[PDB]
Ligand binder design. Sequence first.
Ligand code: CLA
Ligand SMILES: CC(C)=CCC/C(C)=C/CC/C(C)=C/CC/C(C)=C/CC/C(C)=C/CC/C(C)=C/CC/C(C)=C/CC/C(C)=C/CC/C(C)=C/CC1=CC(=O)C(C)=C(C)C1=O
Ligand SMILES: CCCCCCCCCCCCCCCC(=O)OC[C@H](CO[C@@H]1O[C@H](CS(=O)(=O)O)[C@@H](O)[C@H](O)[C@H]1O)OC(=O)CCCCCCCCCCCCCCC
Ligand SMILES: CCCCCCCCCCCCCCCC(=O)OC[C@H](CO[C@@H]1O[C@H](CS(=O)(=O)O)[C@@H](O)[C@H](O)[C@H]1O)OC(=O)CCCCCCCCCCCCCCC
Ligand SMILES: CCCCCCCCCCCCCCCC(=O)OC[C@H](COP(=O)(O)OC[C@@H](O)CO)OC(=O)CCCCCCCCCCCCCCC
Ligand SMILES: CCCCCCCCCCCCCCCC(=O)OC[C@H](COP(=O)(O)OC[C@@H](O)CO)OC(=O)CCCCCCCCCCCCCCC
Ligand SMILES: CCCCCCCCCCCCCCCC(=O)OC[C@H](COP(=O)(O)OC[C@@H](O)CO)OC(=O)CCCCCCCCCCCCCCC
Ligand SMILES: CC1=C(/C=C/C(C)=C/C=C/C(C)=C/C=C/C=C(C)/C=C/C=C(C)/C=C/C2=C(C)CCCC2(C)C)C(C)(C)CCC1
Ligand SMILES: CCCCCCCCCCCCO[C@@H]1O[C@H](CO)[C@@H](O[C@H]2O[C@H](CO)[C@@H](O)[C@H](O)[C@H]2O)[C@H](O)[C@H]1O
Ligand SMILES: CCCCCCCCCCCCO[C@@H]1O[C@H](CO)[C@@H](O[C@H]2O[C@H](CO)[C@@H](O)[C@H](O)[C@H]2O)[C@H](O)[C@H]1O
Ligand code: OEX
Ligand SMILES: [Cl-]
Ligand SMILES: [Cl-]
Ligand SMILES: [Fe+2]
Lengths: 37, 51, 34, 30, 31, 31, 334, 51, 39, 39, 34, 171, 341, 38, 78, 63
Amino acid sequence: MLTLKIAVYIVVGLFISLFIFGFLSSDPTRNPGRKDF
Amino acid sequence: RAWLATSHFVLGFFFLVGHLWHAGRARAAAAGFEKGIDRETEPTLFMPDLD
Amino acid sequence: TYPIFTVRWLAVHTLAVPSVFFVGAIAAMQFIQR
Amino acid sequence: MESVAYILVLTMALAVLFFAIAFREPPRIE
Amino acid sequence: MQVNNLGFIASILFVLVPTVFLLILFIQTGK
Amino acid sequence: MQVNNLGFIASILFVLVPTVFLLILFIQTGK
Amino acid sequence: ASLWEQFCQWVTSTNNRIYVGWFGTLMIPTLLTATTCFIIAFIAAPPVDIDGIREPVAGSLLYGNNIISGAVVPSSNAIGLHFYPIWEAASLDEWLYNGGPYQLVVFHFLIGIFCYMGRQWELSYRLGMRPWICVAYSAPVSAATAVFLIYPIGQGSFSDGMPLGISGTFNFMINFQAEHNILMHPFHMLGVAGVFGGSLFSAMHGSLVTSSLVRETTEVESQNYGYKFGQEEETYNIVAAHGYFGRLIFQYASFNNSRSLHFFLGAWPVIGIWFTAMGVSTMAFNLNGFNFNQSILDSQGRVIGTWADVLNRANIGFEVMHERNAHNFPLDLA
Amino acid sequence: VFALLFFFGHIWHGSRTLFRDVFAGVDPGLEEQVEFGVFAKVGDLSTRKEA
Amino acid sequence: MDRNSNPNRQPVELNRTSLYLGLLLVAVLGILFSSYFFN
Amino acid sequence: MDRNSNPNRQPVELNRTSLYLGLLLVAVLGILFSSYFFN
Amino acid sequence: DWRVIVVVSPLLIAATWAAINIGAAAIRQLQDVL
Amino acid sequence: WVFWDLELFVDPRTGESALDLPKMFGIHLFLSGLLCFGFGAFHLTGVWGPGMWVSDPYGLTGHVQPVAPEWGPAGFNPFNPGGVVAHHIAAGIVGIIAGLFHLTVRPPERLYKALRMGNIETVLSSSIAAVFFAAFVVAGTMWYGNATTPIELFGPTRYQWDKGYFQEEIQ
Amino acid sequence: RGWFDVLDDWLKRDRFVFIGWSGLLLFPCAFMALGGWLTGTTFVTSWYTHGLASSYLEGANFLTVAVSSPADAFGHSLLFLWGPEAQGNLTRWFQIGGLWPFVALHGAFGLIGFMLRQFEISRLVGIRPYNAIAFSGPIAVFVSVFLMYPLGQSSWFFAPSFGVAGIFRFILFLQGFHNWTLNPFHMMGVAGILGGALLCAIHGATVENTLFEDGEDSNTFRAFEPTQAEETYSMVTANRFWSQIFGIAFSNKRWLHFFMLFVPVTGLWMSSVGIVGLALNLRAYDFVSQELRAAEDPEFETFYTKNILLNEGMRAWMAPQDQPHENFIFPEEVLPRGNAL
Amino acid sequence: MTPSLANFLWSLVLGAAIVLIPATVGLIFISQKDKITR
Amino acid sequence: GTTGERPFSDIVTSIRYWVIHSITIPMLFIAGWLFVSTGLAYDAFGTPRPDEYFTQTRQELPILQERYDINQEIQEFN
Amino acid sequence: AQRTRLGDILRPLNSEYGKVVPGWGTTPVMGVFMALFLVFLLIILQIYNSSLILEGFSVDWAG
Ligand code: CLA
Ligand SMILES: CC(C)=CCC/C(C)=C/CC/C(C)=C/CC/C(C)=C/CC/C(C)=C/CC/C(C)=C/CC/C(C)=C/CC/C(C)=C/CC/C(C)=C/CC1=CC(=O)C(C)=C(C)C1=O
Ligand SMILES: CCCCCCCCCCCCCCCC(=O)OC[C@H](CO[C@@H]1O[C@H](CS(=O)(=O)O)[C@@H](O)[C@H](O)[C@H]1O)OC(=O)CCCCCCCCCCCCCCC
Ligand SMILES: CCCCCCCCCCCCCCCC(=O)OC[C@H](CO[C@@H]1O[C@H](CS(=O)(=O)O)[C@@H](O)[C@H](O)[C@H]1O)OC(=O)CCCCCCCCCCCCCCC
Ligand SMILES: CCCCCCCCCCCCCCCC(=O)OC[C@H](COP(=O)(O)OC[C@@H](O)CO)OC(=O)CCCCCCCCCCCCCCC
Ligand SMILES: CCCCCCCCCCCCCCCC(=O)OC[C@H](COP(=O)(O)OC[C@@H](O)CO)OC(=O)CCCCCCCCCCCCCCC
Ligand SMILES: CCCCCCCCCCCCCCCC(=O)OC[C@H](COP(=O)(O)OC[C@@H](O)CO)OC(=O)CCCCCCCCCCCCCCC
Ligand SMILES: CC1=C(/C=C/C(C)=C/C=C/C(C)=C/C=C/C=C(C)/C=C/C=C(C)/C=C/C2=C(C)CCCC2(C)C)C(C)(C)CCC1
Ligand SMILES: CCCCCCCCCCCCO[C@@H]1O[C@H](CO)[C@@H](O[C@H]2O[C@H](CO)[C@@H](O)[C@H](O)[C@H]2O)[C@H](O)[C@H]1O
Ligand SMILES: CCCCCCCCCCCCO[C@@H]1O[C@H](CO)[C@@H](O[C@H]2O[C@H](CO)[C@@H](O)[C@H](O)[C@H]2O)[C@H](O)[C@H]1O
Ligand code: OEX
Ligand SMILES: [Cl-]
Ligand SMILES: [Cl-]
Ligand SMILES: [Fe+2]
């Protein structure tokens, strides 16, 4: 169960970090309109 | 406790809705399409078909 | 120079007159003690 | 064996969903 | 479970008959 | 008669499946 | 040009058949996990001790349930609101016996649907659309959150959450009526207004557009072929629709502005579902529907029954039989 | 049940009979006829009030 | 008496979208009514 | 990568005589094997 | 019953007041329509 | 199906297929009247025919028997089989007379245009109406009990249980 | 100029409230229905038919007032004012529930009048009569629920009463006695009504959020002209959005608007079919397989069996007060109940 | 001639006299006095 | 846009309308009030007054049981 | 259009297509018969519904 817990924690942490670093990476500029901001 | 909990849950939910309303509007207005799609430069007209 | 009495006038009164009558009656009931 | 019937009809529904998405009539601008 | 012994033929036909109707119609479209 | 309780579904499908195959093919011929 | 930048461009790409987006990078794993566990549980999960009195309830097809009766059973009352992942069970069979699949499926589902809402905003942003489709989608999200999260939290147990099944849903509703008189709650009444009116207006708008289509086809073909995807021109005459509807009722009860009409169509059911979601969410804290039991007394003081009293008799009948072995004390405090 | 469903058939086929000329859709006009007050009689082009 | 060709014959059509809608309808109707057929 | 039209597609045909022969075959096969399916 | 008279009386007052204040215009609309 | 193009179906003056729906209705109403009268006057009466199922009020002696028509107001008691016989004789006669009128007198212009008498879909619309009327009537008479729905053939009604009909008679 | 044509002229005039030939049957009938309901809910009791107070005069509120159904003793008698029960006595007619058949029959003829008005106005204006066809759903529901269900039952007594809490009672009664939630016909109706609401919300929201920039103001509502030839929102953008969000999307607006009519209307028709079944007690009450198993296997429990138990409790605890004419004397000891509670 | 038959026949008479007849007389009169001018 | 009738905004903003309705609406309101407060409505509709639901001879519901003769049952129920 | 012997015998029964009487014709008499039929339906309905009780018989399985 410890192996499974560590696996789940790793997967969830990777997905959450991917979310955060994605919406941090100039996300307002990724649109078809004005992108100066 | 019932009055306070029920009241503040409702207010919290409607303020989440307000956050979404103003956050989406702030994003669209910063980007310049909060008033609708421009007919000449509609983005989907310059995007490839999905299939 | 619009007409006073029309079909619309009657459509308005057929509903408004009994409605105010009933509202007054229901107002009276608010004071009935058992 | 009624379990087989239930799973089969559910599977038909899900497979129809897959085909309707993956292989739909492509909307075209005419 | 003591199910209706006619439930399986009924469910199979209830689905398969309109299914084949639809498939026949779709496959012959454009003739 | 204590028949095989699967005989009826089997006979129905044994005939109906190739039947619908044939009907589908015939009706779409000429497209 | 960096690899992270390339990945960002792919994630936020509007040319993917299914949009992913950052919200999608969370939506897809969570919803996929929830779907896999739900299908496996609904087919094969062993019985679940929902009421924590060691009386397992069969929810899965292989244990004797049909599609109508099958469900993923909420986790045991003994768990209450405790977090119960797989790695907190001494065996998968203990996890199953105590209703762990319910917790896994609901938590992943809830995360997935909130991410679905965010994803709707995200794609609207990438398409240069206006941003509020997600606001309309927040109504069903609020209702689902009410039945799967808020109601359990207020009642103190995930065992009180809506079961993931058809007959399980009816059980939830019946128990909810018995303990909260939801029929006599004004927010449920607004929800019923929202859904009855949403269907009414859907029928009205659909019928008025269909009635007022511009002639484009011959009588041998479907009228739908009179519309071409992407055409500039309107496919029905709103002026004719307004003339008909403003003569059906009166001129001022009819919309002549499609924008105002489509706003009303969106707002009415959305607002009604927000109210009903908040109603379920507030009866989670036991602020129940109207109580008019023995409200009317004659002069001597004898009770004159009303329809609310008969409804109360029905509710008492439901209440005295529910969870028939779970109560040891006279009052159902949760 | 059949009687109930045959009520729909009646309304459907009676509508098809009475509305046969508009089955494929409405006329390319109808921009003046369906307006309010323009005619004394709803639909009658010979009752234009001209006022 | 001769067998003349009838001019009132029309082709029938069912597009792919209608196929998918009809198949989903049949599937969900089966999902719904199977439990009641088995009873 | 694009989805190009395959040029190897051929129409399939089953004439009416083949339909009748196949239907009679299926019918008589059912007539033959039904007694053994029921047993 | 006295109660019927008392209930009908404000109705009579309403009608007679409206008739006093509208009647000449009502008569004119009547003549204008024969 | 094969010999679809008969000259009977074309309008002699023009070239296109045409049915005189009013005259069609006159012939068919006259035939319906003849059949209704015959069924009532020969079959149900037993003059030439077996009659109809009649039973005691408690469904113990059910048998087919000639039924004389009841021409009084008692003929409108739904539990009186003589009412059924009388109806078929009288409605058959009235249908005969109505078919004669419909065979002889053309429809008014007002009605020909208003009901779209040149369109066969008008006949479908009105026939569906008459048919669902009849379906409601037969469902009701089956549910509530009728001389034409005896309990020895279709079983007792729920109202006989509700009212303890047989329990009262047994006591 | 014949008198019929002159009448048809006056009746079809363009006025604030269109009348038409249909109005001769819609307006008096609807007014009788509405006035009867308001009258009964304000002044009339159900004391002699139900043993209940049912008007504002007795102290009930908007939620608890009703035009209650007549007493069981009258069976399906039409309870005409001049009928053999009331015999022209207005007070007795009120006290025996005569207002229930008055409201129901005037409402049925008023609904017929409203559908005829739909047809008539559609023909005058020159449009297709799909609004009239859509309204057949509501009429199917009214006929099946308020007429055919009580007609199949013992009397008008078991018809739903015209009131908020009366309707709630009828709903709970159908749950506890008919297991109406288990009925597939109701399930199709639920799917139709919920899908209709969903379609309404999603079309409205999609249209409002794919609007073309047709004006300078933030108030996008002013950017639409009723006579403009151009679509006010992008169907291509909407289609792409939903194709990438949901996997599929409407691409034909005509099919979209037909679907918005088809779904709720079809749901009302299907639920009506199920109610017609319930008129004869033809209920999807039980799954016999699960009843046989639970009878033989006392360890076996599903949500279905639990709902069965809930229904038995409702029936036993509600019957004596809900059906006061049957003189149901159920002593406390026979009332089903779980432990403690 | 039972009382129920008497009341039925009176219902026919009074329905005609209190509703249909006054209604059609009023409708005919008003349609004639307020004619549409073409 | 206008079917011939005077616009409601023009009607309700006018002196003569309110000169009439300052009396008509109140008179209707008081007519209904008096209908209730004089006890007329109880007699008209047969609704029991608060001290007439139960009598000395009857402590239970007056549920109707006759098919036809209801004047008699309601009289005996009092 | 193919001619047959039966068609020729039945030709004159399908030979008056679209013939009408100018104006209102027999519409008033038609309305009178329709009103009488409505009254008749009301009578039989009310007898069946026990709102119209006649002498001599009872609406009952007995007669
Ligand atoms: C179009 C309008 C309309 C329609 C369709 C109905 C329909 C109905 N009403 Mg309602 N009614 C209406 C308007 C209408 N009403 C109005 C405006 C009022 C207020 C005055 C009422 C007041 C009312 C009451 C108080 C009651 C009804 C009732 C009924 C039902 C029974 C009717 C019946 O059997 O009468 C049959 C009568 C006719 C069909 C009319 C006569 C038809 C024939 C052809 C006429 C014969 C000619 C005549 C004999 C010549 C004599 C004329 C005279 C000069 C002598 C039925 C559903 C009853 C009900 O609801 O039961 C619960 C009931 O008690 N009605
Ligand atoms: C093991 C497993 C798998 C477990 C599951 C077991 C289980 C619980 C099984 C049950 C499953 C199931 C399907 C049960 C339900 C059965 C049931 C009740 C069936 C009802 C069938 C029926 C005949 C009902 C009658 C009424 C009816 C026709 C209902 C249909 C409802 C319906 C489909 C409505 C629409 C719903 C919907 C999602 C619509 C989206 C449409 C859409 C793409 C809109 C977007 C859009 C909008 C715009 O505005 C524009 C402009 C554009 C462009 C555009 O695109
Ligand atoms: C429970 C299961 C039952 C199913 C019932 C419901 C049906 C759902 C099925 C829908 C999926 C079908 C999408 C079709 C993909 C397609 O056409 O192109 C697939 C393309 C690229 O493939 C291709 O890949 C090619 C690779 S290569 O370059 O040619 O080598 C390349 O040409 C290019 O990238 C592209 O064309 O992929 C994309 O568009 C980007 C990502 C799409 C995937 C999103 C996730 C899918 C579902 C997860 C969401 C949660 C679900 C929860 C439970 C359902
Ligand atoms: C609660 C709402 C109230 C509902 C009623 C409201 C009013 C509607 C009226 C009813 C509609 C009449 C039907 C159509 C008109 C018609 O028949 O043609 C009208 C004809 C032709 O007009 C004549 O036509 C003549 C020429 S010819 O006929 O075309 O040849 C011409 O010379 C002459 O000038 C001209 O007048 O005129 C007449 O013959 C006048 C009598 C009309 C007879 C009415 C038919 C039914 C009556 C019996 C029903 C019993 C009553 C109880 C009802 C339940
Ligand atoms: C002989 C005994 C039995 C006979 C067997 C034959 C049975 C006939 C069955 C016919 C199938 C009808 C379906 C075709 C459907 C179809 O053809 O697609 C929709 C179709 C499209 O119409 P068009 O006018 O565009 O026609 C284009 C042509 O291609 C169609 O032929 O319109 C309809 O048919 C509308 C009515 C049905 C609409 C149904 C939509 C509902 C789908 C929702 C899915 C369910 C999900 C619910 C979730 C809760
Ligand atoms: C997925 C699980 C199951 C799949 C289901 C699909 C099953 C496939 C079944 C295919 C059907 C094959 C039959 C087609 C038959 C057919 O198409 O007609 C004959 C056909 C004609 O061939 P041609 O070369 O002329 O092709 C013309 C085309 O129209 C054919 O596609 O030739 C053959 O197929 C020869 C082999 C079968 C010949 C069978 C003739 C015997 C008939 C005798 C009748 C019985 C009487 C016996 C009395 C004792
Ligand atoms: C989260 C990421 C995405 C994952 C989504 C996975 C599935 C969602 C999409 C479902 C595809 C439905 C295809 C229907 C058939 C299809 O291809 O429809 C596509 C069709 C296309 O419309 P068009 O305007 O292109 O068609 C116009 C005419 O040609 C019609 O003949 O759209 C509709 O008709 C929408 C209304 C039906 C919407 C039905 C929704 C029902 C949902 C599924 C029910 C649940 C069953 C499961 C039981 C176990
Ligand atoms: C039955 C009957 C009859 C008839 C009668 C009638 C027709 C009546 C009427 C009546 C009426 C017709 C009445 C009315 C009333 C109404 C009311 C009662 C009102 C109310 C209101 C309210 C209360 C509201 C409120 C509100 C809201 C909620 C919203 C907004 C605000 C306000 C405040 C406005 C006859 C004689 C034939 C015979 C015998 C029987
Ligand atoms: C990549 C993004 C970030 C990912 C990094 C996360 C990696 C995972 C680290 C934590 C996961 C394991 O964390 C460890 O789990 C075990 C469960 O067996 C816990 O163990 C706990 O419960 C177990 C048994 O249930 C007891 O024996 C123990 O006394 C108790 O501490 C530890 O308290 C915790 O420290
Ligand atoms: C379009 C359809 C609408 C129709 C409905 C409209 C309202 C109809 C009301 C009909 C009322 C009939 O009500 C009935 O009237 C008759 C005569 O007044 C009364 O009759 C009573 O007095 C008359 C006086 O001559 C006697 O001849 C009669 O024998 C006696 O019973 C009944 O006691 C009463 O019940
Ligand atoms: O878990 Mn499910 O239902 Ca909520 O109230 Mn207390 O708990 Mn049990 O009893 Mn009633
Ligand atoms: Cl329970
Ligand atoms: Cl406890
Ligand atoms: Fe729209």
